[PDB]
Write an enzyme that holds these catalytic residues in place. Structure first.
Site, PDB file in Angstrom:
ATOM      1  CD  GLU A  13      -0.744  -3.572   2.584  1.00 35.40           C
ATOM      2  OE1 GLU A  13       0.283  -3.388   1.890  1.00 35.40           O
ATOM      3  OE2 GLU A  13      -1.103  -2.786   3.484  1.00 35.40           O
ATOM      4  CD  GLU A  61      -4.311   1.337   2.540  1.00 37.47           C
ATOM      5  OE1 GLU A  61      -4.304   0.085   2.473  1.00 37.47           O
ATOM      6  OE2 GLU A  61      -3.394   1.999   3.070  1.00 37.47           O
ATOM      7  CG  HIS A  83      -0.364   0.372   2.498  1.00 32.58           C
ATOM      8  ND1 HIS A  83      -1.045   1.027   3.507  1.00 32.58           N
ATOM      9  CD2 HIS A  83       0.892   0.162   2.973  1.00 32.58           C
ATOM     10  CE1 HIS A  83      -0.247   1.193   4.542  1.00 32.58           C
ATOM     11  NE2 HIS A  83       0.940   0.690   4.242  1.00 32.58           N
ATOM     12  CG  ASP A  84       4.241   1.778   2.213  1.00 36.38           C
ATOM     13  OD1 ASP A  84       3.306   2.191   2.941  1.00 36.38           O
ATOM     14  OD2 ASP A  84       5.149   1.042   2.662  1.00 36.38           O
TER      15      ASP A  84
HETATM   16  N1  LIG Z   1      13.425  -0.237  -1.135  1.00 35.84           N
HETATM   17  C1  LIG Z   1      13.098  -0.807   0.023  1.00 35.84           C
HETATM   18  N2  LIG Z   1      13.615  -2.033   0.362  1.00 35.84           N
HETATM   19  C2  LIG Z   1      13.284  -2.643   1.549  1.00 35.84           C
HETATM   20  N3  LIG Z   1      12.418  -2.024   2.419  1.00 35.84           N
HETATM   21  C3  LIG Z   1      11.910  -0.828   2.076  1.00 35.84           C
HETATM   22  C4  LIG Z   1      12.225  -0.193   0.903  1.00 35.84           C
HETATM   23  N4  LIG Z   1      11.559   0.993   0.855  1.00 35.84           N
HETATM   24  C5  LIG Z   1      10.833   1.104   1.976  1.00 35.84           C
HETATM   25  N5  LIG Z   1      11.043  -0.016   2.725  1.00 35.84           N
HETATM   26  C6  LIG Z   1      10.481  -0.323   4.020  1.00 35.84           C
HETATM   27  O1  LIG Z   1       9.078  -0.619   3.935  1.00 35.84           O
HETATM   28  C7  LIG Z   1       8.505  -0.434   5.244  1.00 35.84           C
HETATM   29  C8  LIG Z   1       7.060   0.002   5.080  1.00 35.84           C
HETATM   30  S1  LIG Z   1       6.166   0.326   6.607  1.00 35.84           S
HETATM   31  C9  LIG Z   1       5.749  -1.378   7.091  1.00 35.84           C
HETATM   32  C10 LIG Z   1       6.764  -2.026   8.031  1.00 35.84           C
HETATM   33  C11 LIG Z   1       6.387  -3.425   8.498  1.00 35.84           C
HETATM   34  N6  LIG Z   1       6.281  -4.332   7.369  1.00 35.84           N
HETATM   35  C12 LIG Z   1       5.082  -3.381   9.254  1.00 35.84           C
HETATM   36  O2  LIG Z   1       4.071  -3.871   8.709  1.00 35.84           O
HETATM   37  O3  LIG Z   1       5.038  -2.856  10.371  1.00 35.84           O
HETATM   38  C13 LIG Z   1       9.420   0.536   6.019  1.00 35.84           C
HETATM   39  O4  LIG Z   1       9.837  -0.053   7.221  1.00 35.84           O
HETATM   40  C14 LIG Z   1      10.570   0.830   5.029  1.00 35.84           C
HETATM   41  O5  LIG Z   1      11.814   0.999   5.619  1.00 35.84           O
HETATM   42  C1  LIG Z   2      -6.896   1.882  10.594  1.00 34.64           C
HETATM   43  O1  LIG Z   2      -6.012   2.910  10.936  1.00 34.64           O
HETATM   44  C2  LIG Z   2      -4.723   2.826  10.408  1.00 34.64           C
HETATM   45  C3  LIG Z   2      -4.350   1.849   9.515  1.00 34.64           C
HETATM   46  C4  LIG Z   2      -3.029   1.833   8.998  1.00 34.64           C
HETATM   47  C5  LIG Z   2      -2.159   2.732   9.365  1.00 34.64           C
HETATM   48  C6  LIG Z   2      -2.524   3.746  10.287  1.00 34.64           C
HETATM   49  C7  LIG Z   2      -3.810   3.756  10.775  1.00 34.64           C
HETATM   50  O2  LIG Z   2      -4.212   4.728  11.699  1.00 34.64           O
HETATM   51  C8  LIG Z   2      -0.674   2.836   8.917  1.00 34.64           C
HETATM   52  C9  LIG Z   2      -0.229   4.245   8.469  1.00 34.64           C
HETATM   53  C10 LIG Z   2       1.094   4.183   7.654  1.00 34.64           C
HETATM   54  C11 LIG Z   2       1.721   5.414   7.350  1.00 34.64           C
HETATM   55  C12 LIG Z   2       2.891   5.421   6.603  1.00 34.64           C
HETATM   56  C13 LIG Z   2       3.428   4.217   6.137  1.00 34.64           C
HETATM   57  O3  LIG Z   2       4.587   4.142   5.360  1.00 34.64           O
HETATM   58  C14 LIG Z   2       5.323   5.331   5.247  1.00 34.64           C
HETATM   59  C15 LIG Z   2       2.795   3.033   6.430  1.00 34.64           C
HETATM   60  O4  LIG Z   2       3.285   1.819   5.951  1.00 34.64           O
HETATM   61  C16 LIG Z   2       1.627   3.025   7.200  1.00 34.64           C
HETATM   62  C17 LIG Z   2       0.977   1.708   7.498  1.00 34.64           C
HETATM   63  N1  LIG Z   2      -0.412   1.825   7.823  1.00 34.64           N
HETATM   64  C18 LIG Z   2      -1.127   0.543   8.079  1.00 34.64           C
HETATM   65  C19 LIG Z   2      -2.642   0.725   8.041  1.00 34.64           C
END
Ligand SMILES: Nc1ncnc2c1ncn2[C@@H]1O[C@H](CSCC[C@H](N)C(=O)O)[C@@H](O)[C@H]1O
Ligand SMILES: COc1cc2c(cc1O)[C@@H]1Cc3ccc(OC)c(O)c3CN1CC2
Ligand SMILES: Nc1ncnc2c1ncn2[C@@H]1O[C@H](CSCC[C@H](N)C(=O)O)[C@@H](O)[C@H]1O
Ligand SMILES: COc1cc2c(cc1O)[C@@H]1Cc3ccc(OC)c(O)c3CN1CC2
Lengths: 342, 342
Positions: A276, A308, A248-249
């Site tokens: 996700e 999303e 989702h990023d």
């Molecule tokens: N090119 C890349 N290679 C490996 N990881 C990367 C990346 N670009 C971003 N990321 C990583 O992708 C993550 C997205 S946030 C989600 C983190 C973890 N999977 C969780 O669910 O909590 C970050 O921690 C970031 O450092």
């Molecule tokens: C339902 O509420 C939430 C759901 C979620 C997030 C925050 C919420 O409050 C966070 C916000 C967030 C912000 C930045 C990110 O990358 C830079 C990232 O991976 C996430 C992950 N997501 C997971 C889904």
């Protein structure tokens, strides 16, 4: 039209800031310690806040009554004033026996760097290729985290807390981790997800694959091996891969590239396990809707084309990246486990 | 406890920033132009937005669907996707025949200078004598307005728009201005309030008493005379005085000082006409409650001890400052005219 009726829309910006203040003042823990069902007066709450300000209770009541009127706190109005309790949502601001709550996530998503970027979210409508965060801060969010330790920490802790919360619910519903022997977590944050998984399934060999600045910030969780890398260049050979809050990023093009690299790293019987929130086709005033719309707008302001996705869209990504079949496991209020099978 | 339920509290910061974006993209006027009951698709709205971004409608839908889920817009999902219409609140984002809406207020109250100060609202609980805005910006809000023209203009326009809205409602119910011959508006903004009054009552000579930087920003309202000064040192001799949205900016001590200077400037039987929202003694799920709580938190973050007040509290101010009698005139959803008689 009576335009007085519109002035109250200013409440919308007041409310998150009132909530942030209440979090930073430890209000939710203080209420909870009196009993999960307790309702406390402002003075009773201030009794547990370190302050010598004689006006503290009057001031705190101004914040709390806005939260109560907005149903973020429960309220009972007594003859001597208001008393305040927790709701189903704000109970989640109280640390569990392991010290975990949603507080790290809520403080990150209203952090100054995030909110500053939100002022430019309209630019995604107006201008092709613009990311609000990049425009506001001069570089992409992950590079910025690599340059700014306080954001690196705030973000990594937000994701870590969210991971423990998510996997506590996943394991009630989804048993697929039981049969696995090795798992590479691509973009696995500080390793909290894998620590949760290995805590529940200690036979699993877990490899956290992350950016160097994240692994540098990571605890030495037992059973977790940290490896630095760039998922767009490739991922380690792996029997199974976890992708949580990564797709989702990214826009579809970058998501497909990630998934193709996963395909290349996996054997024929290997799987990508995707975690996700899933965007419903039908949006409404309910938790599944807001649980997708909230991170969707955070992706819109922070990330390179992140968004999303619906079930149809996730299946489309999987198929575009070479996976033959997708299996969907709804967990709770929109959170899904999805298996992409090769 | 299902801690996933707390993550959605991040919606609270997303929603005001989505609304700000929709305002800046002119969404509400575009919908209105199609019919006060029209529901338009994001593609139809983008047709009326200057953009070369082919992704504009997809991006816009991401903002609007959050507003729809939150009941700020009506939303219907049809074969080609979602369509969006106006609500009673969001209709107030459309300018009337005179060019007036709540837009100037909603843009000011989510302005960067305001939101930056809100990060320190907890300091009012923790520390005696701290104003969040002053702590964030090095000076009080009105001095800052004197130094930063973009804030001076945003604030003055917010107050002016609010003034026309307020007096459009006041004049429907309150006839007390008909009997006046001279009226000094103490802290009268750019003069919009007096222009409304002297336009409706052309026998009235209107004198605006304001800080120089506000008068410098004022339009050439016919018949409105400006006098620069500091109301804490004194106010001009006057047959009657208007105080609108001034007392709520100040703590009791400074409010009493303002009212004492008014008493000194008035003849016997002269009146102070106070226009404020009134805080209900017992809060409930009604418009007057939210219309008082919203400016109350804005006062808490911006102003030197400012606060919204109950009827009892306003009477107490009047009596403490030498006024014999208070008369209360409810106008609409918590807005009152009050007469302090000497
Ligand atoms: N090119 C890349 N290679 C490996 N990881 C990367 C990346 N670009 C971003 N990321 C990583 O992708 C993550 C997205 S946030 C989600 C983190 C973890 N999977 C969780 O669910 O909590 C970050 O921690 C970031 O450092
Ligand atoms: C339902 O509420 C939430 C759901 C979620 C997030 C925050 C919420 O409050 C966070 C916000 C967030 C912000 C930045 C990110 O990358 C830079 C990232 O991976 C996430 C992950 N997501 C997971 C889904
Ligand atoms: N010391 C002072 N002397 C005179 N006016 C002052 C003042 N301090 C603040 N003000 C003014 O008080 C106003 C409060 S905002 C309300 C403005 C106007 N009465 C309205 O209702 O729309 C500001 O315009 C500000 O410039
Ligand atoms: C019901 O909703 C609202 C009500 C009110 C205001 C804004 C709202 O959204 C504004 C906000 C505001 C902010 C700063 C001020 O001085 C620095 C000030 O006088 C006012 C006035 N009030 C009037 C009441």
């Amino acid at each position: 039209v009576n335009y007085l009726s519109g002035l109250g829309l200013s409440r919308l910006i007041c409310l998150p800031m009132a909530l942030r203040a209440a979090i930073e003042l430890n209000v939710f823990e203080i209420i909870f310690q009196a009993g999960p069902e307790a309702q406390l007066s402002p003075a009773e709450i201030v009794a547990k806040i370190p302050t010598k300000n004689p006006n503290a209770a009057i001031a705190l009541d101004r914040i709390l009554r806005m939260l109560g009127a907005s149903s973020i706190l429960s309220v009972t109005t007594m003859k001597d004033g208001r008393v305040y309790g927790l709701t189903e949502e704000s109970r989640c601001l109280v640390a569990d026996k392991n010290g975990v709550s949603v507080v790290p996530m809520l403080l990150f998503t209203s952090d100054k760097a995030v909110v500053e970027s939100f002022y430019n979210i309209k630019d995604v409508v107006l201008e092709e290729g613009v990311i609000p965060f990049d425009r506001t801060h001069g570089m992409d969010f992950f590079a910025y985290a690599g340059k700014e330790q306080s954001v690196n920490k705030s973000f990594n802790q937000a994701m870590g807390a969210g991971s423990t919360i998510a996997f506590d619910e996943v394991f009630k519903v989804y048993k697929g981790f039981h049969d696995l022997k090795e798992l590479v977590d691509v973009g696995g944050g500080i390793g909290t997800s894998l620590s949760n998984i290995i805590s529940k399934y200690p036979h699993i060999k877990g490899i956290n694959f992350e950016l160097p600045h994240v692994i540098a910030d990571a605890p030495n969780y037992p059973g977790v091996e940290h490896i630095a890398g760039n998922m767009f260049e490739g991922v380690p050979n792996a029997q199974n891969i976890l992708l949580k809050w990564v797709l989702h990023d990214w826009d579809d093009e970058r998501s497909i590239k990630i998934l193709q690299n996963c395909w290349k790293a996996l054997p024929e019987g290997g799987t990508v396990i995707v975690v996700e929130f899933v965007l419903p086709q039908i949006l409404g005033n309910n938790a599944e809707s807001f649980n997708a719309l909230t991170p969707d707008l955070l992706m819109m302001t922070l990330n390179p084309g992140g968004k999303e996705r619906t079930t149809t869209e996730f299946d489309g990504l999987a198929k575009a990246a070479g996976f033959a079949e997708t299996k969907f496991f709804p967990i709770s209020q929109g959170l899904h486990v999805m298996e992409f099978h090769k």
